[PDB]
PDB file of C-alpha atoms in Angstrom:
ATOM      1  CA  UNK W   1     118.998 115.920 108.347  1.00  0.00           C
ATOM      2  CA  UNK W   2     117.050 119.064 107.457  1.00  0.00           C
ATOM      3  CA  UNK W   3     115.572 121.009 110.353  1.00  0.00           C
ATOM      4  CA  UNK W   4     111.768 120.763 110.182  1.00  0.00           C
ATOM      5  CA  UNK W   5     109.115 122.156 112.844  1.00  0.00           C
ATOM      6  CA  UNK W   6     105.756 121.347 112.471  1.00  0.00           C
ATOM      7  CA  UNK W   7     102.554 123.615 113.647  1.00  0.00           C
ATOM      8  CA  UNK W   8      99.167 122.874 114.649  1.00  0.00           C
ATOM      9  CA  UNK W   9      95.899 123.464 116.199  1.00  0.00           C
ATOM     10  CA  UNK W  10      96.421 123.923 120.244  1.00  0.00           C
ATOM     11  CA  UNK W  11      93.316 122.610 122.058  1.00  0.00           C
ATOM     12  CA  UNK W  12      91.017 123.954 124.081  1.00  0.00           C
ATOM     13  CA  UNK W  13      93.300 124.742 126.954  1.00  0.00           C
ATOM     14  CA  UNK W  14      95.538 126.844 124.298  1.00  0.00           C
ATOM     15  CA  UNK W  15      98.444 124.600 124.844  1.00  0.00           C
ATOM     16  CA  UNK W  16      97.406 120.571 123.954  1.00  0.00           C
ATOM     17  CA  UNK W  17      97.171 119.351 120.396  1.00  0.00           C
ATOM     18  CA  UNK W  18      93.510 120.167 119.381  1.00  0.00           C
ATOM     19  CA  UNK W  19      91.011 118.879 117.027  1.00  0.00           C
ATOM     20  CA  UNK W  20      91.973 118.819 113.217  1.00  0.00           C
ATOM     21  CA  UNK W  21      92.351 115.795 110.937  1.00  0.00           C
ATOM     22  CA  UNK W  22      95.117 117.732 108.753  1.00  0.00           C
ATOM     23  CA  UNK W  23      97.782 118.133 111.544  1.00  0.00           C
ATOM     24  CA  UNK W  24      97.355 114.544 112.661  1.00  0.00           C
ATOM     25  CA  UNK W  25      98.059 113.360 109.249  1.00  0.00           C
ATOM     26  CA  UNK W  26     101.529 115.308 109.028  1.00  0.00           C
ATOM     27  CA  UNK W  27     102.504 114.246 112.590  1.00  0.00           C
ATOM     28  CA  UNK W  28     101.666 111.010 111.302  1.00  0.00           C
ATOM     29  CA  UNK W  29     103.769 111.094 108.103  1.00  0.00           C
ATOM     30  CA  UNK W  30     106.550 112.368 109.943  1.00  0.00           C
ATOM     31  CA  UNK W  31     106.821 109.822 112.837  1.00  0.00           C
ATOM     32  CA  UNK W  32     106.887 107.588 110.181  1.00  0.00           C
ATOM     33  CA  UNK W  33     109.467 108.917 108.239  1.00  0.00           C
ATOM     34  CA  UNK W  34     111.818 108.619 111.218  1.00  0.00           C
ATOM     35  CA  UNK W  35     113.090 112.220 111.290  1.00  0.00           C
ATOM     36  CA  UNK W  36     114.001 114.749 113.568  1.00  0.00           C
ATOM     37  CA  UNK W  37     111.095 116.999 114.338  1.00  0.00           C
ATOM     38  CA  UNK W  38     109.934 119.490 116.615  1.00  0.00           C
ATOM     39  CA  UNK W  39     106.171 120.308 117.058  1.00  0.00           C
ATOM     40  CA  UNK W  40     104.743 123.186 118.426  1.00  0.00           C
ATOM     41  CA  UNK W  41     101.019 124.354 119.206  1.00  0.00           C
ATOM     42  CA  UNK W  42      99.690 127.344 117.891  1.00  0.00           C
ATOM     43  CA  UNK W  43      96.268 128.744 119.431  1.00  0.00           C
ATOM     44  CA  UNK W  44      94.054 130.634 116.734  1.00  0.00           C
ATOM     45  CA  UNK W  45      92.638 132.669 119.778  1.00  0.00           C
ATOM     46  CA  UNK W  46      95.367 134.471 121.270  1.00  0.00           C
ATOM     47  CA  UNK W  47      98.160 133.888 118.338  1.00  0.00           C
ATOM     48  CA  UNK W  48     101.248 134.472 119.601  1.00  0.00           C
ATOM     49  CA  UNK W  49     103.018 137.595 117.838  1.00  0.00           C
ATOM     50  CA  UNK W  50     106.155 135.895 117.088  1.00  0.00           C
ATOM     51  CA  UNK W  51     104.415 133.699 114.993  1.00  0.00           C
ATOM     52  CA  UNK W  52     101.805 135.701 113.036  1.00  0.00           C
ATOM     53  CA  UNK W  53     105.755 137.347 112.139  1.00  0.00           C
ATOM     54  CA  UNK W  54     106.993 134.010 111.141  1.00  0.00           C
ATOM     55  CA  UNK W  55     103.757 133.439 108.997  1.00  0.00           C
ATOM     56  CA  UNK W  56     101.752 136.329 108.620  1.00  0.00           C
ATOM     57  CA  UNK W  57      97.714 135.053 108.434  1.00  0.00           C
ATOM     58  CA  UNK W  58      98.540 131.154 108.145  1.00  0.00           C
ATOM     59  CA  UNK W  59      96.491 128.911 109.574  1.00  0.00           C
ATOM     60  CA  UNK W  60      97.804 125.370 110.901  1.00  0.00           C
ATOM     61  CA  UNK W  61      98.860 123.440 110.038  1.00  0.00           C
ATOM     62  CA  UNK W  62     101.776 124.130 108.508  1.00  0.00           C
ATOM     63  CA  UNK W  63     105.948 123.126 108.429  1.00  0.00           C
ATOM     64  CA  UNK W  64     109.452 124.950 108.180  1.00  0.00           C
ATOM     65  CA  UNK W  65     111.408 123.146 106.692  1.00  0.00           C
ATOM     66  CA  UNK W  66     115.451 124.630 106.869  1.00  0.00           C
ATOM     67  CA  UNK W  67     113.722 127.777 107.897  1.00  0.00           C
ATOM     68  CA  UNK W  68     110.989 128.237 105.216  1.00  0.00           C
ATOM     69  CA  UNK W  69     107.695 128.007 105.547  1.00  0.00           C
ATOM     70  CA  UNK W  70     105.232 125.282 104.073  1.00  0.00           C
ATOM     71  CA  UNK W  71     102.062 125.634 103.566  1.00  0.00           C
ATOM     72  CA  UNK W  72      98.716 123.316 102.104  1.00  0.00           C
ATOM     73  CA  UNK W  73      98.704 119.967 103.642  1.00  0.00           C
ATOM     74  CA  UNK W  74      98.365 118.096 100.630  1.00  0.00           C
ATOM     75  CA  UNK W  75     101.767 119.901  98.890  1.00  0.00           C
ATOM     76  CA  UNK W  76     103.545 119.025 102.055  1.00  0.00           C
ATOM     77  CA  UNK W  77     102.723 115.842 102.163  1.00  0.00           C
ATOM     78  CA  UNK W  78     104.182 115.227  98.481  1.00  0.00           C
ATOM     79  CA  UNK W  79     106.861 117.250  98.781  1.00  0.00           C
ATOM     80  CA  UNK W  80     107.927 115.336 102.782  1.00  0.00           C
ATOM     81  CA  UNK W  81     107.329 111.758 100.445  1.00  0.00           C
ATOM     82  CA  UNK W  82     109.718 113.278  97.860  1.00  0.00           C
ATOM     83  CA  UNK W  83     112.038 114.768  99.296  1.00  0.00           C
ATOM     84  CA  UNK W  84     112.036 112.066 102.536  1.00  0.00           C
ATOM     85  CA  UNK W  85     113.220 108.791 100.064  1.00  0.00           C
ATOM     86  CA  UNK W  86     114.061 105.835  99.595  1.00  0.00           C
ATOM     87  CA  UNK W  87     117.067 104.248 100.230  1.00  0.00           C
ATOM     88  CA  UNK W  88     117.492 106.799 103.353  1.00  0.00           C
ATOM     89  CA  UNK W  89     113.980 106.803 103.939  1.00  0.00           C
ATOM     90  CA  UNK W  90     110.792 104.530 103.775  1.00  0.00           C
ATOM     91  CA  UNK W  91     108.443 105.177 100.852  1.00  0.00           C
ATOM     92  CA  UNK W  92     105.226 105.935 102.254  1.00  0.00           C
ATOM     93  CA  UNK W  93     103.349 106.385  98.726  1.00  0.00           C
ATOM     94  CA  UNK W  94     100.511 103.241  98.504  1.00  0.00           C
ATOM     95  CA  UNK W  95     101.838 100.741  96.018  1.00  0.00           C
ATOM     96  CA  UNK W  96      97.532 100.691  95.212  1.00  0.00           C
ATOM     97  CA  UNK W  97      96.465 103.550  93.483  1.00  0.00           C
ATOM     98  CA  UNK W  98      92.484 102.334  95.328  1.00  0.00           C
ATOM     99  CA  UNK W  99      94.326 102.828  99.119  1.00  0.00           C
ATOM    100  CA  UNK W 100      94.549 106.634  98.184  1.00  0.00           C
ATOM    101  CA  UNK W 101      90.968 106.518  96.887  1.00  0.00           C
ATOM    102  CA  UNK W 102      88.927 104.135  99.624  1.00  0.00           C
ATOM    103  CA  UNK W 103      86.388 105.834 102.610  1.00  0.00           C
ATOM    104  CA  UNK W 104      87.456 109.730 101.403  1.00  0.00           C
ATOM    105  CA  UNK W 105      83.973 109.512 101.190  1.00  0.00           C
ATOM    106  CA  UNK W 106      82.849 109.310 104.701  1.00  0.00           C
ATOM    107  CA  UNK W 107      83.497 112.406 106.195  1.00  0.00           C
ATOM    108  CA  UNK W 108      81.333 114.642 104.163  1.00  0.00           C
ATOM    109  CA  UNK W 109      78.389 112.026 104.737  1.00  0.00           C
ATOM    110  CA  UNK W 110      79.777 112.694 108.355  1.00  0.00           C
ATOM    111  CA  UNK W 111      79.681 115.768 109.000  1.00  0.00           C
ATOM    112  CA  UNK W 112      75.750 116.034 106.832  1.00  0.00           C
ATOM    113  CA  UNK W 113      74.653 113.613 109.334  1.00  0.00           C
ATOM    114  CA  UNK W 114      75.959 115.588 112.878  1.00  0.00           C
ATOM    115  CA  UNK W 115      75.113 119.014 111.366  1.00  0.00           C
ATOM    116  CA  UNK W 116      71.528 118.391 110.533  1.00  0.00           C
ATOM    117  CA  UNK W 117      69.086 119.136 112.923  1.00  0.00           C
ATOM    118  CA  UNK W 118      65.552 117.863 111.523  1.00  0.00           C
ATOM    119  CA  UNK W 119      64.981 114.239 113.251  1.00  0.00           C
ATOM    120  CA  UNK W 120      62.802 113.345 109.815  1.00  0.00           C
ATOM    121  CA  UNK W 121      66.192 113.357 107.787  1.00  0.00           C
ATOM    122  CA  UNK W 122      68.579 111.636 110.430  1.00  0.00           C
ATOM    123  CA  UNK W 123      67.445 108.092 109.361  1.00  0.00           C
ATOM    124  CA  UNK W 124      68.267 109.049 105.320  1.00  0.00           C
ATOM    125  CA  UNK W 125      71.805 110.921 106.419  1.00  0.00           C
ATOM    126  CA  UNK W 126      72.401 107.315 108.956  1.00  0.00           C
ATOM    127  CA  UNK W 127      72.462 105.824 106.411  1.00  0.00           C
ATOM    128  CA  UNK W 128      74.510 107.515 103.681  1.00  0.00           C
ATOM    129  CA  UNK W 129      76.857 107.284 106.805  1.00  0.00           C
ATOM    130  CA  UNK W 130      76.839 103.662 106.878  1.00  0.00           C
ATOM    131  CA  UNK W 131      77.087 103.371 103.169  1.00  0.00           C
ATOM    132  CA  UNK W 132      80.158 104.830 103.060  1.00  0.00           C
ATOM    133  CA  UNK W 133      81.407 102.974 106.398  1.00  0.00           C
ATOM    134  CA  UNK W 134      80.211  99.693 104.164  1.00  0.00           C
ATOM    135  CA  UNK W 135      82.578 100.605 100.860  1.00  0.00           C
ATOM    136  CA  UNK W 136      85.727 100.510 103.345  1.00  0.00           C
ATOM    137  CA  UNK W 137      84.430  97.769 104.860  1.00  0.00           C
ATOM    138  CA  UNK W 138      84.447  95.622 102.037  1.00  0.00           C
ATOM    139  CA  UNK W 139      87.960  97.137 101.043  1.00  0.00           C
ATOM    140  CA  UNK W 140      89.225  95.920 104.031  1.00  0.00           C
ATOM    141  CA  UNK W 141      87.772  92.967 103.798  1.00  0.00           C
ATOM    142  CA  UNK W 142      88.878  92.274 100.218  1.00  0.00           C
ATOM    143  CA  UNK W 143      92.421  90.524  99.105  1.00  0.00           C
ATOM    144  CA  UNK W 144      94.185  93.305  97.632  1.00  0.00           C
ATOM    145  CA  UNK W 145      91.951  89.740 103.564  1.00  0.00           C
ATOM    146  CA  UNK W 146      93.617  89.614 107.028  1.00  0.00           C
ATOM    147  CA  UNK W 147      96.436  92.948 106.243  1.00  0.00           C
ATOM    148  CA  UNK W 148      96.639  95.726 108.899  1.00  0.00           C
ATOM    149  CA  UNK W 149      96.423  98.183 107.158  1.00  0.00           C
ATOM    150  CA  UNK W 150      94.558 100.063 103.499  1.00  0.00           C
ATOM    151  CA  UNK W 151      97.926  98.904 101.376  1.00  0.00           C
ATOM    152  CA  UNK W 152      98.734  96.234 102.904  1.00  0.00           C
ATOM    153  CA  UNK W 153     100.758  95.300 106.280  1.00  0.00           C
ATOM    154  CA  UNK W 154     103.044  98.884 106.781  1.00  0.00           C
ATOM    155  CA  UNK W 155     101.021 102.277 107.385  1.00  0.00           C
ATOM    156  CA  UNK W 156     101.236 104.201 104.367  1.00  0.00           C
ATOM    157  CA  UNK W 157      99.545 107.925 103.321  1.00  0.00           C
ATOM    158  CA  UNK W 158      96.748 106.817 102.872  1.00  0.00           C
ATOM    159  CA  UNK W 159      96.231 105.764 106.529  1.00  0.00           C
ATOM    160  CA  UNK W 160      97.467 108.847 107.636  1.00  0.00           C
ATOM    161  CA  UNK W 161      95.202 110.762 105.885  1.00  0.00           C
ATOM    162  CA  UNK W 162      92.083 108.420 106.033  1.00  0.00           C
ATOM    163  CA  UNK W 163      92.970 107.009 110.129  1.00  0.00           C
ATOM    164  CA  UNK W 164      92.601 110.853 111.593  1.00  0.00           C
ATOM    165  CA  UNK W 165      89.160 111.294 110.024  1.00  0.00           C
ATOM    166  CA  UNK W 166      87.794 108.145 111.169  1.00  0.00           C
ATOM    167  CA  UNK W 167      88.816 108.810 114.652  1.00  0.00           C
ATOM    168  CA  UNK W 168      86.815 111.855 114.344  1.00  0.00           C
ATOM    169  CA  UNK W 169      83.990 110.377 113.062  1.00  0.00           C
ATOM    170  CA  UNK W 170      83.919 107.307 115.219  1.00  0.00           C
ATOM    171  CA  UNK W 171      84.515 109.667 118.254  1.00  0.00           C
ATOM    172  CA  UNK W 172      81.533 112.809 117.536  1.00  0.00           C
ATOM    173  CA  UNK W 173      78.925 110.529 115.834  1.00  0.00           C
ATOM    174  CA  UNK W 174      78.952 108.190 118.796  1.00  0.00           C
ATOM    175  CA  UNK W 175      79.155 111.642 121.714  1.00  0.00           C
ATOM    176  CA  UNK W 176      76.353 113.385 119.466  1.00  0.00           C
ATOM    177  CA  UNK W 177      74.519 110.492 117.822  1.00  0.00           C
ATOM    178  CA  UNK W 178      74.633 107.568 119.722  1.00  0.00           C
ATOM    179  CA  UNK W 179      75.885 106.148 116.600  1.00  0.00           C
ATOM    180  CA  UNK W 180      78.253 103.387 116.758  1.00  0.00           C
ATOM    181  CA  UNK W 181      80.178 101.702 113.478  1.00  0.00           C
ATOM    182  CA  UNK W 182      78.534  98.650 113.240  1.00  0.00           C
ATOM    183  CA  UNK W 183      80.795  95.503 114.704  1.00  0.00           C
ATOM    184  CA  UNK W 184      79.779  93.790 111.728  1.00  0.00           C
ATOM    185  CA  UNK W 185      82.188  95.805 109.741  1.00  0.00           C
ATOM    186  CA  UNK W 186      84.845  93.513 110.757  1.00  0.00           C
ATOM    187  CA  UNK W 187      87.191  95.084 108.254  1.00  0.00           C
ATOM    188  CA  UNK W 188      86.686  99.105 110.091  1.00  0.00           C
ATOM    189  CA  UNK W 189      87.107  97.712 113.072  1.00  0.00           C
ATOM    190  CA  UNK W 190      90.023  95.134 112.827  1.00  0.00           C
ATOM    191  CA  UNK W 191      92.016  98.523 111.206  1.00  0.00           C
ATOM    192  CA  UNK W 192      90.613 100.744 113.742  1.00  0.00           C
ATOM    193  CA  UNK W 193      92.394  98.045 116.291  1.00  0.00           C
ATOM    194  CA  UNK W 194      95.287  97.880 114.245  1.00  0.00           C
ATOM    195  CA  UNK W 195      95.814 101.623 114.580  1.00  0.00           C
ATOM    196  CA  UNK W 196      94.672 102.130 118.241  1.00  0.00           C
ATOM    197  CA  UNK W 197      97.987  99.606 119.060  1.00  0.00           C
ATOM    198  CA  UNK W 198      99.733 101.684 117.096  1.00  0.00           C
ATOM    199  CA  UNK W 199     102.153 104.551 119.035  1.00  0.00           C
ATOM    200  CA  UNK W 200     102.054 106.719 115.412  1.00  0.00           C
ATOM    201  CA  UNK W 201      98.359 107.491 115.859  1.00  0.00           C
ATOM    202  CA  UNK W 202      97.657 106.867 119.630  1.00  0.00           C
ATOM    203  CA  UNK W 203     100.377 109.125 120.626  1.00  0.00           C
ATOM    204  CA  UNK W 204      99.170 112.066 117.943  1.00  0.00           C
ATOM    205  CA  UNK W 205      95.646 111.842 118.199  1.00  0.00           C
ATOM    206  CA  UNK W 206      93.937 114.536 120.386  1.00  0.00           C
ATOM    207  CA  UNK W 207      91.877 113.017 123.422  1.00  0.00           C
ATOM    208  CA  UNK W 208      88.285 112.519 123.255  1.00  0.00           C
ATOM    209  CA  UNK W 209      87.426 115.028 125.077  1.00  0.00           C
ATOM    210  CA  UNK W 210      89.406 117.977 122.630  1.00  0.00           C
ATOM    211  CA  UNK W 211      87.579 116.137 119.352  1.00  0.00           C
ATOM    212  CA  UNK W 212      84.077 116.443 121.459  1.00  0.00           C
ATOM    213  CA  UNK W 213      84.292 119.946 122.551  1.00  0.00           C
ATOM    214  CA  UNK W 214      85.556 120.926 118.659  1.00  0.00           C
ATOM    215  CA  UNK W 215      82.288 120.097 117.741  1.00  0.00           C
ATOM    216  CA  UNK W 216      80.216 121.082 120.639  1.00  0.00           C
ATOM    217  CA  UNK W 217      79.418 124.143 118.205  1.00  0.00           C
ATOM    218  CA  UNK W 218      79.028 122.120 115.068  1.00  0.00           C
ATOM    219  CA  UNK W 219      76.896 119.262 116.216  1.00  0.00           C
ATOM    220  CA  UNK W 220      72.910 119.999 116.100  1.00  0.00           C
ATOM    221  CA  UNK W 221      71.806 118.041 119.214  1.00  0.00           C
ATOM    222  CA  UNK W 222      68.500 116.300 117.847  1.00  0.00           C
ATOM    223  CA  UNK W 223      65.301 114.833 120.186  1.00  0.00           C
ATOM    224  CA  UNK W 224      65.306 111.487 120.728  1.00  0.00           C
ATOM    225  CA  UNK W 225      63.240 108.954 118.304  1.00  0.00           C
ATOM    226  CA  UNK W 226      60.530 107.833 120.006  1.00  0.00           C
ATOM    227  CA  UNK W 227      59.170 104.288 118.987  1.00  0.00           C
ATOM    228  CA  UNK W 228      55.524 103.817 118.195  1.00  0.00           C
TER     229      UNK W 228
END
């Protein structure tokens, strides 16, 4: 097989994996590939020498694949699925063109919501939030429906991409917002469930703590509504 290393974003501790939706996503793809991989943490505040040598001003993440560098996650990811095929390999591309498309909308509303800081705009920004949340929902929900997953029953790209952003969101809004996804999205949350009992995320995914303290910067703390 080819010899492929993957870096990413160390944590806080400048060793763990850290925060970032975009490493997650090519662990992800990866694992599910099925081939040999090493993975190694690279911390943006005291970058190791050797590597700034190996790729001079590159942010993670990024692969080597036989010995040369890779760079932009989203050229990686379609060269790995290329590359990676079938019959050796599974083909991870969504057989519906709609899985690549559904809740790529949520993190912007997302990250709108935990970065603004006036209390008389939370409500409107809440709510873009759970407009978005209520599209996937009724993706989910609709027969492309009982399936694990955005495609169907086997994790595809799309979940790879889409799975580490929810995390995020699910995680900050509810440290920094109180805000939970509503349990009457039963289609969010029967995925989310899906993918917690699922080694390929739960073993990649940064602990809450790491996705908290990434945003301890970035979230505007706000005062608390007070009825009547």
């Amino acid at each position: 097989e080819p010899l492929i290393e993957l870096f990413v974003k160390a944590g806080s501790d400048g060793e763990s994996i850290g925060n970032c939706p975009f490493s997650q996503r090519l662990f992800m793809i990866l694992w599910l590939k099925g081939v040999v991989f090493s993975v190694t943490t690279v911390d943006l505040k005291r970058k190791p020498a050797d590597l700034q040598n190996l790729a001079p001003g590159t942010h993670p993440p990024f692969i080597t694949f036989n010995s040369e560098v890779k760079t932009d996650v989203n050229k990686i990811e379609e060269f790995l699925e290329e590359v990676l095929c079938p019959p050796k390999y599974l083909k991870l591309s969504p057989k519906h063109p709609e899985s690549n498309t559904a809740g790529m909308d949520i993190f912007a509303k997302f990250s709108a919501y935990i970065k603004n800081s006036r209390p008389e705009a939370n409500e409107a920004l809440e709510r873009g939030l759970l407009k978005t949340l209520q599209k996937l929902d009724e993706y989910l929900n609709s027969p492309l429906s009982t399936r694990k997953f955005l495609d169907g029953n086997e994790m595809t790209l799309a979940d790879c991409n889409l799975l580490p952003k929810l995390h995020i969101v699910k995680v900050v809004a509810k440290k920094y917002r109180n805000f939970d996804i509503p349990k009457e999205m039963t289609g969010i949350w029967r995925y989310l469930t899906n993918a917690y009992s699922r080694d390929e995320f739960t073993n990649t995914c940064p602990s809450d703590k790491e996705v908290e303290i990434a945003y301890s910067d970035v979230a505007k703390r706000l005062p608390s509504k007070v009825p009547k």
